[PDB]
Design brief:
Chain A: GO terms for molecular function: ATPase binding; calcium channel activity; inositol 1,4,5 trisphosphate binding; monoatomic cation channel activity; signaling receptor binding; store-operated calcium channel activity; transmembrane transporter binding. Chain A: One of its GO terms (biological process) is response to calcium ion. Chain A: Keywords: ANK repeat, Calcium, Calcium channel, Calcium transport, Cell membrane, Disulfide bond, Ion channel, Ion transport, Membrane, Metal-binding, Phosphoprotein, Repeat, Transmembrane, Transmembrane helix, Transport, Zinc. This is part of a larger assembly, with 1 copy of chain A (430 residues) and 3 copies of chain B. Chain A has 430 residues and is mainly α. Chain A has 18 helices and no strands. Chain B is 65% helix and 0% strand. Classes of the chains: A mainly alpha (430), B mainly alpha (686). At the A-B interface, helix 3, helix 4, helix 8, helix 12 and helix 13 of A face helix 9, helix 24, helix 26 and helix 28 of B. Bound molecules: ligand YZY (3 copies), cholesterol hemisuccinate (2 copies) and calcium ion (2 copies). One calcium ion binds next to helix 21 and helix 22 of chain B.
Chain lengths: 430, 686, 686, 47
């Protein structure tokens, strides 16, 4: 089962071809593989099966790692299963991240360059494995294709930042192993940087899970639909940026003559710098009163008033005029999207499924680290193609014949016939 | 350069003689065709069974032009008639009679299509009747999940064929005409089939649309038969027919079970139900709104009186009054409202109870509330008993009833556990966090929320709030789906922020006013613990989280900046992106929902009305203190069904004739008709 | 009981014989009709000119059935032929020729309709041509608002007729086919007529829709003729034709004047313009995305030099380079961008100045900004002069340019004034509220905002941003209307609130930190004054107004409650209602605008491209230091137009024949064709 | 005036129907019958 054409279809973005029932049927058969009854089992039984497979994902993986021929080793082959096993692996990883702080790093609050707790070490393995997977994938498939789909693109940064985090940790453990109070640490102390980067990666890791939505028939369409509209936001972004800076400049010009929006008592310092002016206006966007109207100067009434007008106008333009527009755009956008959601979702899910169809990737990340006839084929293809072509022609013939409505031309043609017959007879009979 | 164009799908070409023969058939020159046939016999220069490049042989070309004369001529001579019956059925000609009467690869029909199936797929009552007259059979479609039969478990041989074959049988079984002609209870079968098709749509994901289309077809058929009723006698005979007491609106009930919404909403059906609902108030429709209002008010006020009379002597005139459904509804609504008023009094100095008596004695108000609570629970028990867990569970509101009742029970239990083990009266501030009394009060309040929200159910009754309620409920589903997406967003950022600030957590003691958390005058440690993080991000959606919650005490610029960026991104994604998308999504949904609100609302209202039509009913406070006949009934039903089916067939034809453009093929036939007439006349006159 | 039904407005009835006569005409029985006529001539028993219940006579029945044989028969017997031509023209048949050749009370046509007018309304080129061949004239409609002519003062009598008659005339003059056959320059005629019709749509409030429709008909006609161009030589001959230099895209300019957006956006037209725009950049668009960026950036950086070269040696390689439209755009944009960058440098206050010096000497950056300012001014001056005030006034951005520039002027004036006077230095605090320096700074800031927001215009040059910019503009009009309503509400609540709290105003000194207003740490005296009340209500829209501001210190409970209630009602009306309604309205428009987004954007883009296509152009900083020919041109234009018209007429006909369904009239015609045919044959065979 | 307005109205409606109503299947059937009936008649006379 090379599934060459199927793959070329996805390459050439043949969404309709991929969403045609005949193709969907073929796919499902392959996806569930021998686990066909799965389709028939009642929701309850299916739910149970899925959970069971996932829980023992390491065990099943091990079986394949040891006796791929074993019935269990075979279980991982079923594309559907691999998905479950690989999905569980990721979830366990996310768990490790969660238990990293909630239930660890309890006495290293003030230890600069802290040691590498086992959690860190384990996580390391997973990160490595996930990286390797990307490489292998990028290798086999290619580059642009790999970069095209998001789960991969996020997988790059995520893995990157994760890599940096652990690196800096090693450097810190060496250079700075002090045990001073956290407060006394320099703002850019390696440990501080690592923790910040690690945290951000954690956000990215979870966001990645969005891909799984495609599989669900309920939330999958919506997930895809949202992504579609996520493009039209870009347009709005450009417009807003211009507005943000336009007003930023003016505010700074009128005000440049503990500190910032982020303090209990918001200071006019919000406008003193430029970046601050940007932040300050940024929070106004949300229209939930994140920044007070204290644009007043310490004292300059006029100067303070004009400032109020400037900020007020910004709010009216952005919070009201621009936003409502955004909604309008989204509304129109979704309408059209709603029309083809099925096709789009199907194509997406298929692209996802095929990834598992391959035999190249079988082992979840943590384990993954552990490493002529042609004439006949063509002949048959031609036979089948001949049939499909004939069927197509006949079918189209019938469809048109039974749908295409008569036209004035046809009427006129008929009337001509009646006339010609009329005349002919009239002449033949004087 | 140039791109060469060569024919690769090589195909043999028809001899000039052959080609000519085919052309004559298309023009209807019986003579020329006749001559050609005769000559070919003697001379053998043209295969009478030749075919156009488009696969149109002579018999087929004749059938499409519907020239039965030429058809007979061709058939008389030995012309292959393979699959011709099928073409004559697809085209829906009644020249099928001729082919059936004669009886002596690259097919446009799959190997599974049998004449009866194709006729059914076409829905030609006549053509179908012909075939059915001769013994005909459509294979049984093994039930869903019939994998047990190795027969179906051998789908491995050819799945696509199996699936397609299955759809073809159902596409046939679900034809309104075949169900009219072959089924004993056309209405019941359509109900059942509709359901099965629905279920299959789910199991067979591919072909989902197809199965769903078929189900709607079955649902429409049943409604249409109902619409063909011309007297109330017929409507009763139909709606009160029990397959196997009677006179219980049995089929109306089965229709509600199978979600046959349209059937239930049919005008006539609604009218009958209304008469039963408003019994005791004839002309209630004509009653002035004010008058109505007055009547309702009085009855509700006297609800206790009516409730008792029944208990004492159901036979009593008064006893009789509460039995009427509309009354039951009004009485039962008043009881609930009274209950809710009791709940309101509980929060007042109506009884002015002390607030330091741990394990206090139940107040009078609480005492009075108890009976009702008991009635509500008892009602639920009966509901479960009288309806089975399935029905009870199915109902969404039974879920809320359960929750409300369960809380109103834990409240009682905790109250008791507190009367005992707590005879003192220590200061409220001294009471521990989980003092039973405190927990009890909490549960009671939560339930008071649920109880007052149950009133939304009553809206289904009004003609204005009802449809609105239904539409909103549908939209709620959409919102639920969005929340799932959002949730992942929340979780992501929650973990990130917690992972960044968990180091900088501080003891509540350190905090001002010994308060630690987002719900403190000075919001502090909002991201220190995960749970706080989730809550904090949740509140930030409502702009109740201050921005000074992102600054670490030690003032580490880098960390604070990363945090602020993370918080800001969350706010953009949630408030500016997801929120706005939800709005657009919802806009679309409402447009669609609005269209079917009526059928959705009426179905809902009918279920409500039906609930009261039943006999077992008393308000919650006072809630806890022949073969012969069958045959005749069935005969009457069959009589009505015969009439309805007849009326339906005729109406559908009329609609098809009065609402269908003249396709091109139709024109072609007319042209061929003139052509044939011409040739004939020319010959006779020449 | 029973309602008797009678014919109230009775009309004469047809005798049996007369009924038969008309019946024959509907069946096409020439023989019977002929006989009836002949007998009537003898026994005078039938009024040849009788009328059906629908008022149709024999000739009218024949015309509708299109039986010219019978028509001739009737005409030969001299039947009243009144208005028959009009009926024939409406049926669009060659019976018109017969009636015209046959030359010498109730009507479906108003008394004003004339044969040519109706033909025009029908848009049948052939029938129109036939009528025009014979002298025919359509009255010239008086100019919009021509009261001088007492003839227009006829409106006093039967204005209805006056209005209808006028619309009928225009409905005819606006027929694509008439314009094609009669007008010398079909394109220009359409352009002009489409505009006049638009103006009329406004003046004639009623019948607006009709005039607007007719206008669109004209606009589309022009685009359609252009679409029938096949070679560039033609397209150039058409778009560069000057009615009367040439090679100046004169017609395209006229189109832009008459807002013929579809014409200006036609694909082929847009293609030509592009070639002119990207002169020197073969396949600039084709150039890899990055490549484009590279080239643009490089050219931009070199803008001063290129500009300098043109200044030095207009006739040099470099001097010529700037003349290219795309280069001008690149340069003129880079210049503006640098201007904005200079303004940014002020923000960072790279050149810091003491805050105490009154009227300081203009800072270094200022001087640098001064030239651009002057250049922009002179630019606008040139535009105004060159284009005339009307055109300049028309441009909306011109308003922004005017405002931006004016602010820059004042800023300078004040800067200057503050220098001569206030020459000394004092602590800023001492400075009076309206110190010149202070006011100047504010004006400068506002101007900077305006200047940067002028970049929005550049979005029209982008394929992605442009359409959005255009849509936004369209919506802005509606937003303005909504704002008026909001303002009224604001004023109302402002007046009310101020009316209640003005009794409780307090002194700034009294107020903590001597701060009075809604912009102080603890908001105070929010509703004390109308000016403040207005501000407070505005900021409330954004949630920046705290609720404690609704309480009076003396603590008069009632007043405070009314005050809070008024504030609350305002919030609901403004945020919950009006704001939300704006969303709905904007969604409605965005939907519509989206339908014509591209044409709008492209029309806009062309206008921009055209501006640069001209020759008077240098960046703002360096901005301030034979009849024979016409005959030939016209001949060519006429030839091209002839061909375009020819191919257009044909296309329209072909479309109709292949893209139109068969209406009932068609059935009736066929039925008649067979009927008359039958009768004839039967007679011959009999 | 009413007499005139009704006459004008009725006529307009008929025109609208004729020009804005498609040919239905029943129409096809009638046309077919007309041809068929004519055929039989002619064939009988000529036969
Ligand atoms: C895309 C970008 C282009 C859009 C262009 C223009 C959009 C219109 C801009 C109008 C902004 C004027 C408001 C500035 C301002 O008032 O400053 C307050 C400042 C704050 O001190 O107050 C004042 O200057 C004077 C007090 C009068 C305030 C009332 C003005 C109401 C004007 C309309 C408000 C609309 C709110 C609608 C909410 C449903
Ligand atoms: C579904 C989930 C997937 C969606 C994925 C991505 C959506 C785009 C995410 C972009 C978020 C960037 C904003 C973060 C941030 O700026 O932190 C503020 C923080 C607060 O300190 O400020 C800064 O970090 C730097 C100051 C620059 C602020 C201006 C940035 C503007 C960017 C666009 C804003 C759009 C607002 C539109 C409102 C009409
Ligand atoms: C266009 C302009 C015409 C629109 C006309 C009318 C629109 C309806 C106006 C109703 C405003 C009544 C609210 C005034 C008020 O309650 O003051 C609060 C004041 C504040 O003290 O509180 C009260 O007076 C009594 C407390 C009851 C508050 C609950 C009232 C709820 C009424 C509906 C609210 C709708 C919110 C929907 C949000 C999804
Ligand atoms: C708006 C605030 C004051 C809350 C009021 C709470 C209740 C007093 C309201 C809320 C919903 C109302 C119910 C909404 C639906 C109906 C249907 C209504 O019946 C009809 O509208 C049509 C006649 C019919 O029921 O057959 C009878 C009143 C009732 C129970 C209403 C009774 C009064 C209710 C319980
Ligand atoms: C987003 C923030 C950083 C504000 C940036 C302000 C400017 C640097 C941006 C805002 C709008 C941009 C302009 C938007 C429109 C265009 C059209 C663009 O041309 C095209 O896109 C297609 C080729 C063509 O113009 O023919 C040339 C760049 C330009 C002037 C852009 C130049 C860079 C601008 C001025
Ligand atoms: Ca219940
Ligand atoms: Ca200008």
């Amino acid at each position: 089962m090379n599934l060459s054409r199927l793959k070329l279809a996805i390459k050439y973005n043949q969404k309709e071809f991929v969403s045609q029932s005949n193709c969907q049927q073929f796919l499902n058969t392959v996806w569930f593989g021998q686990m066909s009854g799965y389709r028939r089992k009642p929701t309850c039984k299916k739910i149970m099966t899925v959970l069971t497979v996932g829980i023992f994902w390491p065990v099943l993986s091990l079986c394949y790692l040891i006796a791929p021929k074993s019935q269990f080793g075979r279980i991982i082959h079923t594309p559907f299963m691999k998905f479950i096993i690989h999905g569980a692996s990721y979830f366990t990883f996310l768990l490790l991240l969660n238990l990293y702080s909630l239930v660890y790093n309890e006495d290293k609050k003030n230890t600069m360059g802290p040691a590498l707790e086992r959690i860190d070490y384990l996580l390391i393995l997973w990160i490595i494995g996930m990286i390797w997977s990307d490489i292998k994938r990028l290798w086999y498939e290619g580059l642009e294709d790999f970069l095209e789909e998001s789960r991969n693109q996020l997988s790059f940064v995520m893995n990157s930042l994760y890599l940096a985090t652990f690196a800096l940790k090693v450097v810190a453990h060496n250079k700075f192993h002090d045990f001073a109070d956290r407060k006394d640490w320099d703002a850019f102390h390696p440990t501080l940087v690592a923790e910040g980067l690690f945290a951000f990666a954690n956000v990215l890791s979870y966001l990645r899970l969005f891909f799984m939505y495609t599989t669900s028939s309920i939330l999958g369409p919506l997930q895809i639909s949202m992504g579609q509209m996520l493009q039209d936001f870009g347009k709005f972004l450009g417009m807003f940026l211009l507005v943000l800076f336009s007003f930023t400049i003016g505010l700074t010009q009128l005000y440049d003559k503990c500190v910032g929006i982020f303090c209990e008592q918001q200071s006019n310092d919000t406008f003193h710098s430029f970046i601050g002016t940007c932040f300050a206006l940024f929070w106004y966007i949300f229209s939930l009163a994140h920044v007070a109207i204290f644009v007043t100067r310490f004292s300059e009434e006029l100067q303070s008033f004009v400032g109020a007008v400037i900020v007020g106008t910004y709010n009216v333009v952005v919070v009201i005029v621009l936003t409502k527009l955004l909604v309008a755009m989204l509304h129109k956008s979704f309408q059209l999207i709603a029309n083809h959601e099925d096709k789009e979702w199907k194509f997406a899910r298929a692209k996802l499924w095929l990834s598992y169809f391959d035999d190249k990737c079988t082992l979840p990340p943590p384990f993954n680290i552990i490493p002529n006839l042609k004439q006949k084929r063509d002949e048959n293809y031609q036979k089948v193609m001949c049939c499909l072509v004939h069927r197509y022609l006949t079918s189209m013939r019938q469809k048109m014949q039974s749908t295409d409505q008569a036209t004035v031309e046809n009427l006129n043609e008929l009337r001509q016939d009646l006339s010609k017959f009329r005349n002919e007879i009239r002449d033949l009979l004087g | 350069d140039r791109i060469p164009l060569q024919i690769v799908r090589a195909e043999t070409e028809l001899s000039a003689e052959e080609k000519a023969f085919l052309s004559a058939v298309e023009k209807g020159d019986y003579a020329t065709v006749k001559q050609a046939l005769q000559e070919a016999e003697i001379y053998y220069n043209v295969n009478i069974n030749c075919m156009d490049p488009l696969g149109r042989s002579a018999l087929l070309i004749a059938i499409e032009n519907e020239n039965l004369e030429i058809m007979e001529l061709l058939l008389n001579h030995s012309v292959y008639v393979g699959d011709a019956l099928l073409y004559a059925i697809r085209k829906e000609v009644v020249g099928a009679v001729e082919l059936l009467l004669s009886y002596r690869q690259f097919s446009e029909f799959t190997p599974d299509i049998t004449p009866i199936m194709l006729a059914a797929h076409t829905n030609n009552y006549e053509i179908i009747k012909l075939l059915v007259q001769k013994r005909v059979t459509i294979p049984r479609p093994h039930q869903i999940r019939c994998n047990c039969v190795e027969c179906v478990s051998s789908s491995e041989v050819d799945s696509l064929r199996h699936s397609r074959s299955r759809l073809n049988i159902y596409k046939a079984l679900a034809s309104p005409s075949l169900i009219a002609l072959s089924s004993e209870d056309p209405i019941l079968t359509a109900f059942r089939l509709g359901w099965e098709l629905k279920e299959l749509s789910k199991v067979e994901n591919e072909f989902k649309a197809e199965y769903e289309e078929l189900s709607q077809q079955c649902k429409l058929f049943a409604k249409d038969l109902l619409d063909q009723a011309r007297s109330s006698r017929e409507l009763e005979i139909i709606l009160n027919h029990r397959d196997d007491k009677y006179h219980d609106l049995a089929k109306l009930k089965v229709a509600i079970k199978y979600h046959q919404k349209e059937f239930v909403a049919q005008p006539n059906c609604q009218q009958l139900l209304a008469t039963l609902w408003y019994d005791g108030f004839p002309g209630w429709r004509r009653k002035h709104w004010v008058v109505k209002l007055l009547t309702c008010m009085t009855i509700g006020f006297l609800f206790p009186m009516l409730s008792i009379a029944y208990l004492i002597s159901p036979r009593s005139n008064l006893g009789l009054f509460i039995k009427k459904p509309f009354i039951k509804f009004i009485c039962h609504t008043a009881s609930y409202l009274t209950f809710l008023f009791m709940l309101l009094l509980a929060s007042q100095h109506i009884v002015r109870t002390d607030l330091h008596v741990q394990g206090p004695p139940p107040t009078v108000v609480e005492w009075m509330i108890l009976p009702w609570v008991l009635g509500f629970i008892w009602g639920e028990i009966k509901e479960m008993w009288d309806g089975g867990f399935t029905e009870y569970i199915h109902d969404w509101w039974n879920l809320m009833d359960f929750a409300m009742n369960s809380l109103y029970l834990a409240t009682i239990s905790l109250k008791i556990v507190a009367y005992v083990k707590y005879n003192g009266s220590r200061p409220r501030e001294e009471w521990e966090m989980w003092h039973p009394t405190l927990i009890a009060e909490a549960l009671f309040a939560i339930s008071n929320i649920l109880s007052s929200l149950r009133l939304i159910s009553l809206f289904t009754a009004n003609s204005h709030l009802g449809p609105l309620q239904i539409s909103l409920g549908r939209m709620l589903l959409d919102i639920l789906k969005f929340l799932f997406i959002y949730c992942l967003v929340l979780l992501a950022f929650a973990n990130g922020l917690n992972q960044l600030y968990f180091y900088y957590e501080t003891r509540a003691i350190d905090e001002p006013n010994n308060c630690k958390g987002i719900r403190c005058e000075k919001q502090n440690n909002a991201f220190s613990t995960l749970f706080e993080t989730l809550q904090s991000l949740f509140w930030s959606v409502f702009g109740l989280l201050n921005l000074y919650v992102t600054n670490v005490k030690a003032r580490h610029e880098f960390t604070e900046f990363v945090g602020a960026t993370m918080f800001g991104t969350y706010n953009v994604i949630s408030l500016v992106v997801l929120l706005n998308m939800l709005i657009a999504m919802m806009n679309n949904s409402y447009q669609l929902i609005a269209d079917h609100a009526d059928i959705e609302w009426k179905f809902a209202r009918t279920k409500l009305w039906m609930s009261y039509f039943d006999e077992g009913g008393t308000l919650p406070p006072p809630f806890n203190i022949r073969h012969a006949d069958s045959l005749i009934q069935n005969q009457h039903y069959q009589e009505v069904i015969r009439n309805l089916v007849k009326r339906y067939v005729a109406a559908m034809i009329r609609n098809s004739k009065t609402n269908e453009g003249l396709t091109e093929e139709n024109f072609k036939e007319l042209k061929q008709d003139i052509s044939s007439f011409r040739y004939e006349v020319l010959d006779l006159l020449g």
